[PDB]
Amino acid sequence: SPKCLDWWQAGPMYQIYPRSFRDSNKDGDGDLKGIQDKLDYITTLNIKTVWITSFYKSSLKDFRHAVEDFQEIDPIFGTMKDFENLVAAIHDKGLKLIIDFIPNHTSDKHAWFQWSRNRTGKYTDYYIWHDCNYENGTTIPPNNWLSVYGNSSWHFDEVRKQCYFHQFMKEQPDLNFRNPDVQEEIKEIIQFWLSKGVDGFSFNALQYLLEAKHLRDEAQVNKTQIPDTVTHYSQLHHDFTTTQVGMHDIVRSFRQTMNQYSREPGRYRFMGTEAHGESITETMVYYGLPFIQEADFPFNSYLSKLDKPSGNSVSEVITSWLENMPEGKWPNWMTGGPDNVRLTSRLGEKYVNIMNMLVFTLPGTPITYYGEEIGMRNILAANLNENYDTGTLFSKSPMQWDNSSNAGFSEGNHTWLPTSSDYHTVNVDVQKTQPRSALKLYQELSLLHANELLLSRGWFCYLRNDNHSIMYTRELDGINKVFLMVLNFGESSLLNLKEMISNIPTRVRIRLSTSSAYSGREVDTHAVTLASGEGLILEYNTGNLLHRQTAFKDRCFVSNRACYSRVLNILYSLC
Amino acid sequence: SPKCLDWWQAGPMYQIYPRSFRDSNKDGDGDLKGIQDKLDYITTLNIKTVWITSFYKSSLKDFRHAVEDFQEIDPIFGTMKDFENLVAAIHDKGLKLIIDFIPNHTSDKHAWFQWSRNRTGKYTDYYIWHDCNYENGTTIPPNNWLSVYGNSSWHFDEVRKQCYFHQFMKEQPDLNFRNPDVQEEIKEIIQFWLSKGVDGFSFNALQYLLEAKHLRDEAQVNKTQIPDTVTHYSQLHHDFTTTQVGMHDIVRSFRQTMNQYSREPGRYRFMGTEAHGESITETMVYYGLPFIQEADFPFNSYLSKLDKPSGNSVSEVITSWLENMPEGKWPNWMTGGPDNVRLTSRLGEKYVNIMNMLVFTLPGTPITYYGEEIGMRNILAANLNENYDTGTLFSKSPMQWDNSSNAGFSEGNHTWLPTSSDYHTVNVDVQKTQPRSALKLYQELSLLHANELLLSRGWFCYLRNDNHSIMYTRELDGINKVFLMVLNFGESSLLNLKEMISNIPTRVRIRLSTSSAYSGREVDTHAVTLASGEGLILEYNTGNLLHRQTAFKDRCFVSNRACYSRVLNILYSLC
Ligand SMILES: *[C@@H]1O[C@H](CO)[C@@H](O[C@@H]2O[C@H](CO)[C@@H](O)[C@H](O)[C@H]2NC(C)=O)[C@H](O)[C@H]1NC(C)=O
Ligand SMILES: *[C@@H]1O[C@H](CO)[C@@H](O[C@@H]2O[C@H](CO)[C@@H](O)[C@H](O)[C@H]2NC(C)=O)[C@H](O)[C@H]1NC(C)=O
Ligand SMILES: *[C@@H]1O[C@H](CO)[C@@H](O[C@@H]2O[C@H](CO)[C@@H](O)[C@H](O)[C@H]2NC(C)=O)[C@H](O)[C@H]1NC(C)=O
Ligand SMILES: *[C@@H]1O[C@H](CO)[C@@H](O[C@@H]2O[C@H](CO)[C@@H](O)[C@H](O)[C@H]2NC(C)=O)[C@H](O)[C@H]1NC(C)=O
Ligand SMILES: *[C@@H]1O[C@H](CO)[C@@H](O)[C@H](O)[C@H]1NC(C)=O
Ligand SMILES: *[C@@H]1O[C@H](CO)[C@@H](O)[C@H](O)[C@H]1NC(C)=O
Ligand SMILES: *[C@@H]1O[C@H](CO)[C@@H](O)[C@H](O)[C@H]1NC(C)=O
Numbered sequence A, B: 001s002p003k004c005l006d007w008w009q010a011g012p013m014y015q016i017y018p019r020s021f022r023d024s025n026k027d028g029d030g031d032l033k034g035i036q037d038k039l040d041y042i043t044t045l046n047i048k049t050v051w052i053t054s055f056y057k058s059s060l061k062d063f064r065h066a067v068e069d070f071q072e073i074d075p076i077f078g079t080m081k082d083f084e085n086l087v088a089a090i091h092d093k094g095l096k097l098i099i100d101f102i103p104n105h106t107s108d109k110h111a112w113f114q115w116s117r118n119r120t121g122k123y124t125d126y127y128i129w130h131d132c133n134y135e136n137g138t139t140i141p142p143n144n145w146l147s148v149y150g151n152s153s154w155h156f157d158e159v160r161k162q163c164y165f166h167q168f169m170k171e172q173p174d175l176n177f178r179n180p181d182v183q184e185e186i187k188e189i190i191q192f193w194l195s196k197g198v199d200g201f202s203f204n205a206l207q208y209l210l211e212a213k214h215l216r217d218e219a220q221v222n223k224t225q226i227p228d229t230v231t232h233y234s235q236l237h238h239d240f241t242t243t244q245v246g247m248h249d250i251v252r253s254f255r256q257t258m259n260q261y262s263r264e265p266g267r268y269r270f271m272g273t274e275a276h277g278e279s280i281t282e283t284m285v286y287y288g289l290p291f292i293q294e295a296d297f298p299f300n301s302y303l304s305k306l307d308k309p310s311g312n313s314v315s316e317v318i319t320s321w322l323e324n325m326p327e328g329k330w331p332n333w334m335t336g337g338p339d340n341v342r343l344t345s346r347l348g349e350k351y352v353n354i355m356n357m358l359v360f361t362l363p364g365t366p367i368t369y370y371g372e373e374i375g376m377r378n379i380l381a382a383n384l385n386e387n388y389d390t391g392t393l394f395s396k397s398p399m400q401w402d403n404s405s406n407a408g409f410s411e412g413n414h415t416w417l418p419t420s421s422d423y424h425t426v427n428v429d430v431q432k433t434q435p436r437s438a439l440k441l442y443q444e445l446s447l448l449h450a451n452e453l454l455l456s457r458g459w460f461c462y463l464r465n466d467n468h469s470i471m472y473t474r475e476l477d478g479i480n481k482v483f484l485m486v487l488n489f490g491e492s493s494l495l496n497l498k499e500m501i502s503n504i505p506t507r508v509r510i511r512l513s514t515s516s517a518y519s520g521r522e523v524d525t526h527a528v529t530l531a532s533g534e535g536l537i538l539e540y541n542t543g544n545l546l547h548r549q550t551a552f553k554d555r556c557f558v559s560n561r562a563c564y565s566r567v568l569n570i571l572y573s574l575c
């Protein structure tokens, strides 16, 4: 008898950017009270977890953040009581809530830093201070290290008369995780939010926690370049400021703090991490070891990087994640996020449905960014008098609920960001009346994913794939039924499935289709037609399963194998 | 009720260089059968653990080693049966046996390497192979990395037509610990020796297990130096070939393999490591974490580095180890070893006794190198027709047992190394007849250390120290007795102890003294005389202990605090 799937394994996650979900008090900024009013809509999506990005008291709301108090709410989002009412409303709905945590830096207005730049007490080495020659407005940094946004990562502080370190903007001084006073502070921040009932954290920017103690220069990517023109982050090799040797042991103490709150059954606290962008073998380290426990999964954002809808492009993201993942770990598929271009603008409107069908039929936890379920798109321009990253700001446009003032988001006259011009046709109210929309298909896949027992605990055998088409099967032993997903990223195709499967009848029934005209229509596997961005979930009966054979041992995947008993009507792991 | 001390915590360790202990078959090389004949002498020293350095089948017996078979014995030392008879003899004596393990490299005659240089099967990537331009006997290495003994660490292999990596000599190709086939091989070597009854391992050269995958050049210590004259290891910064990010996780899997054999009580398997030479904060990482288990202790060889007998020199080694050590860990004190100059030649013959008294009264496990108990010294010259390191060879001279042929070591005409000329006066037989010798005092400290309950579980308060004198106290709460160790590394001293302690009577009795004339003589703490290399263990009665006060909270140390009950007659941890 195998162990039940945890709540973070069983249902999709829904990532919300709280300043753009729903506005309650007519001021143009979303708030925690507005998320509580729309909890009913989240349960129609069969969502399991709500993931709210940062809402702490912040002096900078971008550039990975500048938090002035890790135990407070920013005023625009509400108060501490408004958050406690939201958590009670989320739990009584049967949902879970995970929140963003960034432990790397603070704001230069944090009380810890105003005490540190004065050498007040034990706060003197909460940050990384160093002597640097400064005069006439010019400073000589202790080394050639560059900030992620590009300039010397050392900044002179006139009060302390030294230089402090920052990986990000100068408003974001880096905390010193080599001393144990700072790790006790972060330990107390975790315990404060886990006490309020938060079901887990998403830790971001963990690869920047530690830097080399010797403070030696980095090696330039171009060896023969004049050292005074090195100002771009991509012009250096980052061997001393990223993923130092003691970094994963700090992450493991975060996990051990969260184990104190995850003992009682039903209240396991989730831990997730932002993946290393340029390396997938460094990402799989966060999965932990057979004897050392770490993150529950690192968030896989490699599907949200693709800017060309190709068959070989998607196929490569899938196999590379499942090949490198440790043996019995849980995959996850994130097709969009706050800092990448929305799916409709990146790939095209004809690919919205095919992409919802992909992440819901792959093995693991599908993670959904708000607006992706209705085919939302990037806004073309904005006018913001606040410090934001204009390269990534346009995917945070307010949610489109109906055809009304500000797409039914604010009920005021102004919103912090403009809504898309096509909210008259693309909105939640309109899409849930028409029979086959982007929102309707999402609700059919979310419901299918919930109660199938074949998509949640079934094997995954990835069949061959020419470009422009992806095929794979989900199957469990004692079920006598398999799902066959055919996804066509090409211009068209009329392909023969009897050649490819060799385990398929001549008449199979269509369980679901993105075009949605094939409601329950049967098809003949001799000649199946796929119209350039269409996907089918075929369902039929068979005994000879694909993973039993020796030809497919290499391309079948399962997290924890468990056969099914038609007699006893239970999963059992002995098989 | 606190947990009992393990066998590696309770008694001293005795390090034996097996080729120089005792020769059985007249061939001039010590063997495992010769160690079994002298087990009686090891129990007169009250030794708990025997530590035998490497004896595997080796093509190179120095330069950290070149092993041709990790599951065989070198012929000069005996056979597999001779080892099984030695382990049975060691256990039936009540002793433990730990052995050396080096997992970094092999010999170029290993079967794994003769299969790897031919690309035979899965052995093709057991080692680190790379393409390099070779012609006319000259080779262009893949980067500027240097071997520890100084030259390019890449060597061209004519059969494979590539370059292989070696941190040490070219006869020692480095294993590839990034693939899992090699870590399964080392896992099976550990299980093979733990099955034979070996009670633990000493892992050496663990900081060299991993190297950077990118193979980028190191940074020169002298930035403006011509790159073709960089041939010394000390001319580079070793950021890519030493202590890479995944190294401690490989050590932790070694520990987890040894936990399968350490479950039954009385048979815990010890794990020790060779310390990082130039850094003490990197050494304390091997102690592990509160939640991740690693080495039981890293071997502290900082006492064996001192080449000047100074009071401030010894005092600095002691405080730096106890300050940086994690909270409840076990210290260890190694005053000599196979690769450093013996204690008599490094400091002087007048400092042999004072150094035995130091490591036996400090808190932790004292580790003894064979010959140190009788005041052995380095030989002046040798004539070896084998590849050895002449800089460190002279501390491996054969053990001096009596005034006979070859100091009673071989019973043959030749020995692999000559014995010291002064074996007529310095030998075990002579020293155990005269009343107060180096061997006699060692047996009194070893016996005192065994059954005292104050030196094994007592606090350690390090009192003030002018140069030329070291004072410290060992005390437990419910015992009503304290030991006061006065060690004089200066030229002479007549010091007043009533000024320094303020808890001491005017008449205290001498428990032990290196000069040994003070057998049971009482002394007056008004004027105590110490003759330039003398040490006293003073013993008296008091109630107001030194660690109870607030002035000494900073300079008292204990591994696991536990008071003593005069009524119940047990240690209890609630105090
Ligand atoms: C580093 O910081 C400076 C701070 O001013 C940035 O400034 C640019 O400076 C050049 C001339 O020195 C101007 O032509 C640019 O207009 C400045 N930038 C802006 C946005 O006004 C500089 O860009 C930074 N280096 C980076 C980001 O690589
Ligand atoms: C690395 O940088 C050097 C110098 O910046 C580049 O070499 C050329 O140097 C001359 C100097 O007189 C410049 O006029 C050229 O513009 C430089 N070339 C380029 C492409 O910038 C060298 O090419 C750089 N290496 C690269 C770009 O790989
Ligand atoms: C690197 O390896 C070479 C291999 O020969 C070592 O050789 C020395 O070479 C110089 C001239 O090239 C001779 O004068 C020396 O006598 C050679 N050494 C010996 C021991 O004979 C060289 O020393 C090595 N580099 C080191 C060890 O730093
Ligand atoms: C680093 O190396 C350079 C060059 O090897 C040293 O600079 C001097 O360079 C001239 C070149 O004409 C030599 O004649 C001198 O002998 C070099 N000086 C020395 C001390 O070797 C530079 O000094 C070195 N840096 C050090 C040793 O810190
Ligand atoms: C700055 O320093 C002064 C004196 O050094 C101190 O009185 C003041 O409280 C400090 N400011 C802060 C914000 O700690
Ligand atoms: C003052 O600033 C100028 C900038 O042109 C600089 O060259 C000079 O060294 C500075 N001198 C002092 C004393 O700060
Ligand atoms: C949507 O809103 C517009 C303006 O508010 C209105 O004219 C239109 O009738 C609405 N749509 C429907 C279906 O009622």
Ligand SMILES: *[C@@H]1O[C@H](CO)[C@@H](O)[C@H](O)[C@H]1NC(C)=O
Pocket: A026, A412, A413, A414
């Ligand atoms: C919003 O602004 C409009 C004019 O811009 C004004 O007529 C209206 O009263 C405002 N609404 C609120 C709630 O203040």
Ligand SMILES: *[C@@H]1O[C@H](CO)[C@@H](O)[C@H](O)[C@H]1NC(C)=O
Pocket: B114, B115, B118, B120
């Ligand atoms: C060397 O290679 C040949 C053929 O490639 C093979 O027959 C031989 O066994 C190899 N030698 C060793 C020691 O494996």
Ligand SMILES: *[C@@H]1O[C@H](CO)[C@@H](O)[C@H](O)[C@H]1NC(C)=O
Pocket: B135, B136
């Ligand atoms: C041969 O060796 C000489 C060494 O003087 C070298 O200069 C030359 O490049 C080499 N040529 C070939 C073809 O190996």
Ligand SMILES: *[C@@H]1O[C@H](CO)[C@@H](O)[C@H](O)[C@H]1NC(C)=O
Pocket: B403, B404
């Ligand atoms: C030690 O050995 C020498 C030579 O074997 C011998 O002359 C001497 O008497 C021995 N010492 C004692 C105390 O017997």
Ligand SMILES: *[C@@H]1O[C@H](CO)[C@@H](O)[C@H](O)[C@H]1NC(C)=O
Pocket: B026, B412, B413, B414
């Ligand atoms: C040792 O060598 C000597 C001469 O060097 C010889 O007389 C003696 O017999 C040898 N001993 C043995 C055991 O071979």
Ligand SMILES: [Ca+2]
Pocket: A104, A174, A175, A208, A209, A210, A211
């Ligand atoms: Ca940092």
Ligand SMILES: [Ca+2]
Pocket: B104, B174, B175, B208, B209, B210, B211
């Ligand atoms: Ca290695």
